[PDB]
Scaffold this active site. Structure first.
Site: not given
Ligand SMILES: Nc1ncnc2c1ncn2[C@@H]1O[C@H](COP(=O)(O)OP(=O)(O)O)[C@@H](O)[C@H]1O
Ligand SMILES: [Mg+2]
Ligand SMILES: [Cl-]
Ligand SMILES: [Mg+2]
Lengths: 19, 355, 5
Positions: B152, B56, B39
């Site tokens: 993961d 997210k 997404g």
């Molecule tokens: N709460 C957050 N604050 C800042 N950066 C984030 C956060 N959650 C995820 N990210 C960034 O988004 C990237 C993807 O992680 P995430 O969205 O948690 O899972 P996915 O990789 O499945 O999308 C990570 O490398 C991280 O750097």
């Molecule tokens: Mg994921």
């Protein structure tokens, strides 16, 4: 991932790296 | 609903904890800090508090079991990123339902910090290795105590606040409540961090696969690069065997019994002290060998890892960060996360930490 | 890639 096919590839790789 | 003030987006969102009591939430300053096939990930400023958050956005209606929202709602730990609110909205695909997760925003990750030291040709100071590894094991101990497996674990999923040195685990899109006797997907980890039982196609693994991934992270921090690289499972398995040596028949049976009758060439193990640099602390090598074990039940539990002598420096009363601040919370263990081994509190909580 | 339904 059939174990027969997977094991064959792994053996072929390990033989190449083996001393 | 979108109305002017910056653009202020207003939604009715459900708080992560407690029963469902949705309330209006206003935020602004929307910008993309990530994007993928799952997404979109956004940054936002909450209008009320002004605190930065990450949103997210995913399409949680697919073939895969989507446990991410339900798992996160149960989690409340200082080393796990908090889910503030969640809501639903229309996505890029018309007529579709997209889930929105509002989490605490964290600026950095272990991977980003580590990559800087790799680029600079320096080595990550061992104090940060102890701090980051210790907090990850606390988070794993907490989630494992509920029977949840992250599946993961890797540096990109370890968020960092470099000012406070606080680590936050995230990316619960692959986590699952593992049930003893229910098969699971065998393609669940990421490249360089899959345990050997996963690489052998095991469907009956346990939460110990997270411990293997932690060992991969630990070695990566000590090494400056991934320890078991490789595009394919055979490639990565060859890297593992070249370090750990050829697994025994009993070790193979512990991972997947379907491979016990194959004649794998016997490759000698490479000593751990020769894997890492000569400056590597002995206790880090000792901890690493107890994490990267072929037999899943031989690997340390997350709670046992926190009690390892490699983390003795963190338990020092006079330990301070390189920038001068006091270390983050490290000994505020709850009985829930101490459930697996309550007697470990003798070592986990130093005598000064009790007031 | 979670468990298939
Ligand atoms: N709460 C957050 N604050 C800042 N950066 C984030 C956060 N959650 C995820 N990210 C960034 O988004 C990237 C993807 O992680 P995430 O969205 O948690 O899972 P996915 O990789 O499945 O999308 C990570 O490398 C991280 O750097
Ligand atoms: Mg994921
Ligand atoms: Cl308006
Ligand atoms: Mg990720």
């Amino acid at each position: 991932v059939e174990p027969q096919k997977f094991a064959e590839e792994l053996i072929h790789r390990l033989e190449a790296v083996q001393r | 609903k979108v109305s002017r003030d910056s653009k202020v987006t207003t939604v009715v969102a459900t708080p992560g904890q407690g029963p469902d009591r949705p309330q209006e939430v206003s935020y602004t300053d929307t910008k993309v800090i990530g994007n993928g096939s799952f997404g979109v990930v956004y940054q936002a400023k909450l209008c009320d508090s002004g605190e930065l958050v990450a949103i997210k956005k995913v399409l949680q209606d697919k073939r895969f079991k989507n446990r991410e929202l339900q798992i996160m709602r149960k989690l409340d730990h200082c080393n796990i990123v908090r889910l503030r609110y969640f809501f639903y909205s229309s996505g890029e695909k018309k007529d579709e339902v997209y889930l929105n997760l509002v989490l605490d925003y964290v600026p950095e990750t272990v991977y980003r910090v580590a990559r800087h030291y790799s680029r600079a040709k320096q080595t990550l100071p061992v104090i940060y290795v102890k701090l980051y590894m210790y907090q990850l094991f606390r988070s794993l101990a907490y989630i494992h105590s509920f029977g949840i497996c992250h599946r993961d674990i890797k540096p990109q999923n370890l968020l960092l606040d470099p000012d406070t040195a606080v680590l936050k685990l995230c990316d619960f899109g692959s986590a699952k409540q593992l049930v003893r006797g229910e098969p699971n997907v065998s393609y669940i980890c990421s490249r360089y961090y899959r345990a050997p039982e996963l690489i052998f196609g095991a469907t009956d693994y346990t939460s110990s696969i997270d411990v293997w991934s932690a060992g991969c992270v630990l070695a990566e921090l000590l090494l400056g690069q991934p320890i078991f690289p490789g595009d394919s499972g055979v490639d990565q398995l060859v890297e593992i065997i070249k370090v750990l040596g050829t697994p025994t028949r009993e070790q193979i049976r512990e991972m997947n019994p379907n491979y016990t009758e194959f004649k794998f060439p016997q490759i000698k193990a490479h000593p751990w002290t020769k894997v890492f640099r000569p400056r590597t602390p002995p206790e880090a090598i000792a901890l690493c060998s107890r994490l990267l074990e072929y037999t899943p039940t031989a690997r340390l539990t997350p709670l046992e890892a926190c009690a390892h002598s490699f983390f003795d420096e963190l338990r020092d009363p006079n330990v301070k960060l390189p920038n001068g601040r006091d270390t983050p919370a490290l000994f505020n263990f709850t009985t829930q996360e101490l459930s697996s081994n309550p007697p470990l509190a003798t070592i986990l909580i130093p005598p000064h930490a009790r007031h | 890639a979670p468990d298939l339904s």
